[PDB]
Structure formats: structure tokens, C-alpha cells
Amino acid sequence: HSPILPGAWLGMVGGGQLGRMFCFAAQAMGYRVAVLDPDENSPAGAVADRHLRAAYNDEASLTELARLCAAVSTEFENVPAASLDFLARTTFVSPAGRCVAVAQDRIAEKRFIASSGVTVAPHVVIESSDALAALDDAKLEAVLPGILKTARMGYDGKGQIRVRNAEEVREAHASLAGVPCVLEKRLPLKFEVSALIARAASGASVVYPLAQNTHRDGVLSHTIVPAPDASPTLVQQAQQAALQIADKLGYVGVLCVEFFILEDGSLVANEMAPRPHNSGHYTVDACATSQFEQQVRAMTGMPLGDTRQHSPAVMLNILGDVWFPDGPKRPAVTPPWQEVAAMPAARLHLYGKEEARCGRKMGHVNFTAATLEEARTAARDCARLLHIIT
Ligand SMILES: Nc1ncnc2c1ncn2[C@@H]1O[C@H](COP(=O)(O)O)[C@@H](O)[C@H]1O
Ligand SMILES: [Mg+2]
Missing domain, CATH: 3.40.50.20 (Rossmann fold)
Incomplete structure (x- = not known):
């Protein structure tokens, strides 16, 4: 190349x-x-x-x-x-169609990740209505209570149904129009992390620090970097897992792998995105090379960039709900951007979308500071200001 x-x-x-x-x-x-x-x-x-x-x-x-x-x-x-x-x-x-096909399908991606030697959640694959009909209730109950998720991705929790018993699994599958799905056991989650890597056609790779992600209603809410609750051992394990997946995939580009850390401390891989990722936006303001620049380098065959994190960081997502402080039925109110910009830590990123709608990602604010606790404090103050938290 x-x-x-x-x-x-x-x-x-x-x-x-x-x-x-x-x-x-x-x-x-x-x-x-x-x-x-x-x-x-x-x-x-x-x-x-x-x-x-x-x-x-x-x-x-x-x-x-x-x-x-x-x-x-x-x-x-x-x-x-x-x-x-x-x-x-x-x-x-870059990345190739073959790689995207695996990563975009929840069934294929969990099979592939397991085949890479990385643990995934206990699950039952449901290829079709005919296949589900042949499964006994006990096979479903082993992973219940659980989440039924379509193999074809729905962003932001779409295409997913909570299920507590076998009959609910069967009704849920019909409600999802019989498409291929994965039934995953609900697991006891202590926290969630994402590993962000970039891989070149040569096989060279770089890794970012581990990010600790919080989701509300299945939507990423904020990201804290470096992960405060992840030991150096866990960081290396998550980074290595993401690199092992990328190597086995022949992946060229930026890859984000999302993991659960369970209450017993085990690391479970959930999802992988064949692209820069919402949990990687902090890299723009916190790292020497942002994930978007890695995407440029990987697709051009240029050397990959240094991932050095020069400042601790917290990313806060800005959803359209922020425009509706008096509720979704009441008129939109422009958020107080002047007060956000008055925060020294705040780096404001607005996407230029014209219409604010609930659930719609309108932007994010990165908070960088000399210390993580200063950055986390500023992000929480901004969340209160925007009524993301009380
Ligand atoms: N097997 C599971 N156990 C517990 N929580 C889950 C599970 N799968 C998904 N979630 C939650 O739902 C969020 C989005 O799910 P997903 O659509 O699988 O990315 C995750 O970040 C978790 O917080
Ligand atoms: Mg995926």
C-alpha cells in the first residue's frame, strides 16, 4: 500500500x-x-x-x-x-466489507469475539421463528431473565426487549417480526468500559486508555478516561482482547470494543463498532491523535498516531431532551450555552443539527483538566446545569 x-x-x-x-x-x-x-x-x-x-x-x-x-x-x-x-x-x-459484516451483526460478532478467545455473555442464538419453535423452554430459561436483541443493529436500545420467561421470549420474537436475534442473559454489572484501538494494514496497532462508560436507557450518557475503577491488569486485558479481535479479523481502521465488568470482577465483551465511537470523542481534546485522525491514517496507509493522553477527561453527551426542560409537550428552550462556555474545563461540540428531538444526539461536551476529579466535578456541574441530573 x-x-x-x-x-x-x-x-x-x-x-x-x-x-x-x-x-x-x-x-x-x-x-x-x-x-x-x-x-x-x-x-x-x-x-x-x-x-x-x-x-x-x-x-x-x-x-x-x-x-x-x-x-x-x-x-x-x-x-x-x-x-x-x-x-x-x-x-x-478500510475497514473491509467483510469486517463490517461481522461487526454489524450481533450474532456474527459474538461468535467471532468468542472465537478470538474473548468471553461473551451467556446467550442463545435464535436464527428464525422455526428455530425458536424447536427450542425447549429450558434452553431459553438458562439465559433468563435476559434481553432479546435483533441481530441487525438498532442504535440506542432499539430492537431490544426485556424478557423474564420463555413465553415472553416467544412473544418478543414475534413482536420483532421474527428476525434473527440473540437472547442474552442479563448480567450483574459493576461497571462498563470500552477499549479503543487502531490497526494498520501492516498489522501495526495503537491503543487508547480504557474508557469507563455510563449508559442511561441504553444510550451512552458519559465517558470517564482513564477508567477510575479499572486496574492496570484489567486495562491490559481489555486492550489485548480488542487487539486480538482486530488481528484475527484482519481489521484496518479504528475499532471500539465495549465490555462489562461484573460484580465478581470478570470481563465480558458485549459489542464492537467498526468505526470511531461515541466513547472515543474525548480523544479530540485529551489525546495527541484523535480517533478520527487514526481513521485517516489507517485508511491512507499512513503511520498511526501517538495515543498519548495529555489530560484526564470526561465526555458528557448532549441529547435533544436538554431543549425540553418543561417536558416534551412544551416548547423547546435553547440550552444555556453561554454558561457552559464559562466553565474553564468545557470543550463544547455541537453537530449543527437543526431540529432538537428527544433521544437525538445533538452534541457533546468534553471536560479536560489537570486531574480527573476536577474534570468529573465540572462534568457533574454541567449536567446539573443542563438538567441531565438533579
Ligand atoms: N447482557 C446484559 N446484561 C446487563 N446489561 C446489559 C446486557 N446487554 C446490554 N446491557 C445494557 O444495555 C446497554 C446497551 O446494550 P447493547 O444494545 O447490547 O449495547 C449496555 O451498555 C448495558 O448497559
Ligand atoms: Mg457491532
Whole structure:
């Protein structure tokens, strides 16, 4: 792979906030970015050097994107692997369609992670209605109470149903229209962490510090780095697990692997994203090389960047609910950004989305400081200010 040098066109399939942040990182280094996204108002397309407004399966636009760009990546985990393989006919695609296909499917990803030697949650795979009908209640009850999750990803807790008994599993499967699913045992969680790595085509890799993530209603709420409750032994185990997965996958790009730490202290892998990740946004303001810059380097064949964390950090997600302090039925109220910017630790990132809606990620605020406790205090003060907490 002869390195793709500054000045080239780089392609981005998907135009959300992750694609927007990729644009800034690539453009700062002198690259030009073409974003393929069907939405007219895409956050990434707004800042890109070129926006191809097209469906992800549109042959003419895929051909146009691959002709223009020396390398193409994605920020969209559910992108069709066939689209990435189509692009790969004429240009370099990182990560490959084959890798994204494993990572985007909950059944395949848990099989693959287990085959890498990494523990996953006890679960039962439900390929179809016919397969579920042949399973006895006892096979289901072994993983109950549990969560029934569609294999095809639903972001933000979508496509998931709590189930307490076998009859609830069977009704839940029908409610999900019979699609392939994984039934996972609900586990006793002490805390949650994510490992963030980047891997080059050569097999070289870098690792970020472990992040400790808190979710509300299945949506990431905040991230604390370095993880305050993860020992150096656990950090190495989680980083190594993510590297072992990436190596076995032949993965080129940025990979985020989310883990549970149970009450007994064991490490359980849950999910992996074949892209930069919401829990990696802190890297923009806390680390020498951000995850978006790693995505540039990996897809261009350039050397991977130093991951050194120069400042402890906390990321706070900003959801559209922040605009509805008097409830969802009442009018929107613009959040108090002037008071956020008055916090010395606050690094404000707003995505340019026009309409605030509950559950919608509108931005995030990174808090960096000399010490983690100062950063955590500022994030909590900001959460109270924004009515994220009382
Ligand atoms: N097997 C499980 N046991 C306990 N909590 C879970 C389990 N699976 C998912 N969750 C919770 O739901 C969140 C999002 O789930 P997921 O859609 O699997 O990423 C996770 O970050 C957990 O907090
Ligand atoms: Mg995944």
C-alpha cells in the first residue's frame, strides 16, 4: 500500500456527526473529503469538500465516489457490506466489507469475539421463528431473565426487549417480526468500559486508555478516561482482547470494543463498532491523535498516531431532551450555552443539527483538566446545569 498523502480525496460513507468529525481531522491535514449520504441536511455533508447525496446502494454514486477518492471509509456501522465491496473493486476500502459484516451483526460478532478467545455473555442464538419453535423452554430459561436483541443493529436500545420467561421470549420474537436475534442473559454489572484501538494494514496497532462508560436507557450518557475503577491488569486485558479481535479479523481502521465488568470482577465483551465511537470523542481534546485522525491514517496507509493522553477527561453527551426542560409537550428552550462556555474545563461540540428531538444526539461536551476529579466535578456541574441530573 503506497501511502495516500495529503491533498488526496478521501471518501466517507455516512454523514452523521462521526463523519463531520472525520472531515475536520482530514481537512486539517490537507486532505479533501467526499461524503456519501442520502440526507440533504447531513452534518458531515455540510462541512465536506463534496457531498454526494445518494442512497448507500446507488451504483452510479458508489462508482463516482470510488473514482474520485484514493481511499474510502465509513462511519455507518449498518452500511451494506455489498456497498463497501462494490467500492473496493476500484479503490481502497478500510475497514473491509467483510469486517463490517461481522461487526454489524450481533450474532456474527459474538461468535467471532468468542472465537478470538474473548468471553461473551451467556446467550442463545435464535436464527428464525422455526428455530425458536424447536427450542425447549429450558434452553431459553438458562439465559433468563435476559434481553432479546435483533441481530441487525438498532442504535440506542432499539430492537431490544426485556424478557423474564420463555413465553415472553416467544412473544418478543414475534413482536420483532421474527428476525434473527440473540437472547442474552442479563448480567450483574459493576461497571462498563470500552477499549479503543487502531490497526494498520501492516498489522501495526495503537491503543487508547480504557474508557469507563455510563449508559442511561441504553444510550451512552458519559465517558470517564482513564477508567477510575479499572486496574492496570484489567486495562491490559481489555486492550489485548480488542487487539486480538482486530488481528484475527484482519481489521484496518479504528475499532471500539465495549465490555462489562461484573460484580465478581470478570470481563465480558458485549459489542464492537467498526468505526470511531461515541466513547472515543474525548480523544479530540485529551489525546495527541484523535480517533478520527487514526481513521485517516489507517485508511491512507499512513503511520498511526501517538495515543498519548495529555489530560484526564470526561465526555458528557448532549441529547435533544436538554431543549425540553418543561417536558416534551412544551416548547423547546435553547440550552444555556453561554454558561457552559464559562466553565474553564468545557470543550463544547455541537453537530449543527437543526431540529432538537428527544433521544437525538445533538452534541457533546468534553471536560479536560489537570486531574480527573476536577474534570468529573465540572462534568457533574454541567449536567446539573443542563438538567441531565438533579
Ligand atoms: N447482557 C446484559 N446484561 C446487563 N446489561 C446489559 C446486557 N446487554 C446490554 N446491557 C445494557 O444495555 C446497554 C446497551 O446494550 P447493547 O444494545 O447490547 O449495547 C449496555 O451498555 C448495558 O448497559
Ligand atoms: Mg457491532
